[PDB]
């Protein structure tokens, strides 16, 4: 047997992972200890890193509370426990380069709820925590993405509390924050991938509601250009890119009632992006019952894992 890619989908619930193109669903961990608000990520090399949550450390008067950080077990489908995030943040982004797990800007989880242009590195080798080079501004609810050992961060909302059309990248070989062409259209807890060599951003939240908006961006080029737009504005999208196909996954977006109310409702449905016809198509209404899952490509053995 070979690993399969499947749509890997996270939460508080389990991991779930689902195949596509077969409509074939698989149960790949009941274990809850992914906290419900958290990010997620998925190295190169398939390995599968959640931060978020909060605790009471075990030692620091100071800092009373740190970040869950997990690292997902293939061997018995349980989450290891790692040393843990010590900064009490949120609406944080992940991302990773060279030996090295980051955590993105993102804000304080009590009082003030400063926002942050820090960054705290994660050494693969030494397994300690510690800052790196801070941003260039104070960011969160941003989308951070991982390429060729750079690290993009894009969009959310900065010192303002308005939303960014912002982006800028990392390079960590050269200690080098660098800021790219901004975006047409400013957005918050949006969806974002690396989709056949280019940048594609979807949906999201704007100062005044949400968007259905995407764009595409040339890595190359240094250039945006508007791309299919989702069929509904929604916040929290997530895009996954999987073998050369794009889906568009979750997030909430706006039921209008029988009678006529507007009401927020989360989803977890999953749509594709067909290529030939550049429109979106459903695939599923939900894949399971989740609040706030997160969604990533990932290669797993299905004869280990239980159908559903």
């Not at 009471?56 to 970040?67: F, G, L, Q, T, V």
């Not at 843990?84 to 990773?96: A, M």
């Amino acid at each position: 047997m070979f690993l399969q890619d499947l749509i890997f989908m996270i939460s508080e619930e389990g991991a779930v992972a689902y195949d596509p193109a077969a409509n074939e669903c698989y149960c790949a961990s009941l274990s809850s200890q992914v906290p419900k608000n958290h990010v997620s990520l998925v190295t190169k090399e398939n390995q599968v890193f959640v931060a978020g949550g909060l605790f009471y450390n075990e030692d620091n008067k100071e800092d009373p509370m740190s970040a869950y950080f997990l690292q997902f077990d293939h061997l018995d489908s349980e989450w290891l426990g790692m040393p843990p995030l010590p900064s009490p943040r949120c609406l944080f982004g992940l991302g990773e380069a060279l030996n090295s797990i980051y955590v993105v800007g993102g804000r304080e989880i009590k009082d003030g709820e400063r926002c942050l242009d820090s960054v705290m590195c994660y050494d693969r080798l030494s397994f300690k925590w510690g800052e790196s080079d801070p941003l260039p501004y104070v960011v969160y609810g941003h989308t951070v993405l991982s390429h060729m050992d750079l690290v993009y961060v894009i969009g959310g909302k900065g010192s303002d509390r308005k939303c960014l059309n912002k982006m800028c990248v990392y390079d960590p070989k050269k200690f080098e924050w660098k800021e790219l062409a901004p975006m047409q259209t400013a957005r918050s807890l949006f969806g974002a991938t690396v989709h056949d060599g280019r940048i594609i951003v979807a949906a999201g939240v704007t100062d005044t509601g949400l968007t259905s908006s995407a764009e595409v961006y040339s890595i190359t080029d240094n250039k945006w250009a508007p791309f299919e737009a989702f069929p509904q504005e929604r916040s929290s999208l997530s895009l996954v890119s999987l073998v050369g196909t794009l889906y568009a996954i979750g997030g909430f977006a706006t039921l209008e009632t029988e009678s006529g109310e507007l009401v927020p409702t989360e989803l977890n449905d999953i749509w594709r992006y067909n290529e030939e016809e550049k429109k979106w198509e459903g695939v599923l209404r939900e894949i399971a019952y989740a609040a706030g899952a997160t969604f990533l490509p990932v290669r797993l053995n299905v004869l280990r894992l239980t159908k559903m």
